[PDB]
Amino acid sequence: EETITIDSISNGILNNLLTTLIQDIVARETTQQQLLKTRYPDL
C-alpha cells in the first residue's frame, strides 16, 4: 500500500494521544451541560 516511516508512525502515536484527550474533554463538557439543561429548563 503506502510508506510507513518513522515520521508517520510517530504522528500516529501523537494523533491517538491527542484525539483521546479531546474526546475526554468534550465528553466532560457535553454531559455536564446535558445535566444542567435537564435539571434547570429555565436558565
Binding site: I4, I6, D7, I9, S10, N11, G12, I13, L14, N15, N16, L17, L18, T19, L21, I22, Q23, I25, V26, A27, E29, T30, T31, Q33, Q34, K37
Partner: protein
C-alpha cells in the same frame, strides 16, 4: 507483516515510555492554555448548534482542537516519540 503500530505501542507502555510521552503532552497543553481553549470551544459549539450531542459536537470541535496545538508542543513531543522509536525500530 504488518501491524507494527500496536506492537510499538505495547513496548512504549511496558517500558514506561508511554507514560512519559503522554504526561509531557498534557503538561504542555495544560500550561500552553490549550485544554482550557478547547473547553471554551466546546461550549461555544454547544451554543452555536443548540445541542449537547457528543457525536455531533465532537464532529466540529475535534478538527479545530487539533490545529490549536502549538508548533512548539507538536514538534517537541514528536522528537520525544521518534527518539523512542529509534531505540527499537530498524530502518529502510
Amino acid at each position: 507483516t504488518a501491524q507494527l503500530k500496536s506492537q510499538i505501542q505495547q513496548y512504549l507502555v511496558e517500558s514506561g515510555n508511554y507514560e512519559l510521552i503522554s504526561n509531557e503532552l498534557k503538561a504542555r497543553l495544560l500550561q500552553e492554555g490549550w485544554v482550557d481553549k478547547v473547553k471554551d470551544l466546546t461550549k461555544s459549539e454547544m451554543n452555536i448548534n443548540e445541542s449537547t450531542n457528543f457525536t455531533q459536537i465532537l464532529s466540529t470541535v475535534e478538527p479545530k482542537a487539533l490545529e490549536m496545538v502549538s508548533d512548539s508542543t507538536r514538534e517537541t513531543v514528536l522528537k520525544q516519540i521518534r527518539e523512542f522509536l529509534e531505540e527499537i525500530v530498524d530502518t529502510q
